């Protein structure tokens, strides 16, 4: 599968919102607790993500997530396209959160601990952290 493809979705936990980006070819996650599910937050998160990785196209399970001109502007500026055709790893991330949730006071901290655990964990075999970097390097030179 193509190396510039990400998937972006929100989950709710403790009445708060978690934005979850999955790098599809690799399983690597970035995530962030946002105070509300707005186009503002999604636009911002997209700019952050695009500064960090080569992001060509973004899929979602909720297309209306992407309809605001606020979001369309971010994609425009960073040069991102939306999907043309078409786990959950939200599941196990949500498993890992509940697991570490005692280890921290705020949800946001548990989230980051869970992203840490998820991206490092060897599946086998490489880790999602190792696979992303390999995929993206393999695809450069």
Residues 38-57 touching a second copy, rule: CB under 8 A, are 44, 47-48, 50-54
> In this structure, are residues 129 and 118 in contact, taking their beta carbons and an 8 Å threshold?
no
Show Cβ contacts of residue 3 under 8 Å, excluding neighbours closer than 6 positions. 25, 54, 135, 136, 139
Q: Is 139 annotated as a binding residue?
A: no
Q: If you search the block for the tokens 């993206």, which residue do you land on?
A: 136
Q: Which stretch binds ligand LF9 (CB under 6 A): 23-31, 101-109, 117-125, 133-141?
A: 101-109
Residues 53-82 touching ligand LF9, rule: CB under 6 A, are 69-70, 73-74, 77
Query: What residue 70 binds from ligand LF9, a second copy, none (CB within 5 to 8 A, per partner kind)?
Result: ligand LF9
Using rule CB under 8 A, residue 70 touches a second copy: no
Using rule CB under 6 A, residue 109 touches ligand LF9: yes
Determine phi and psi for 83, rounding to 5 degrees. -55, 150
Using rule CB under 8 A, residue 81 touches a second copy: no
H/E stretch holding 16: strand 16-23
> In this structure, are residues 97 and 114 in contact, taking their beta carbons and an 8 Å threshold?
yes
Determine phi and psi for 10, rounding to 5 degrees. -105, 150
Query: Interface residues with a second copy (CB under 8 A)?
Result: 30, 44, 47-48, 50-54, 77-78, 103, 108-109, 112-113, 115-116, 118-120, 129-130, 133-134, 136-138, 140-141
């Amino acid at each position: 599968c193509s190396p510039g493809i990400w998937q972006l979705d929100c989950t709710h936990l403790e009445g708060k919102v978690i934005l979850v980006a999955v790098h599809v070819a690799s399983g690597y996650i970035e995530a962030e607790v946002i105070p509300a599910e707005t186009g503002q937050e999604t636009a911002y998160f997209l700019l952050k993500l695009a500064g960090r990785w080569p992001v060509k196209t973004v899929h979602t399970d909720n297309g209306s997530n992407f309809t605001s001109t606020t979001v369309k502007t971010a994609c425009w500026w960073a040069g991102i396209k939306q999907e043309f055709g078409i786990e959950s790893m939200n599941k196990e991330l949500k498993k890992i959160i509940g697991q570490v949730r005692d280890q921290a006071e705020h949800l946001k901290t548990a989230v980051q601990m869970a992203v840490f655990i998820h991206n490092k964990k060897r599946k086998g075999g490489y880790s999602a952290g190792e696979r992303i970097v390999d995929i993206i390097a393999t695809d450069i030179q």
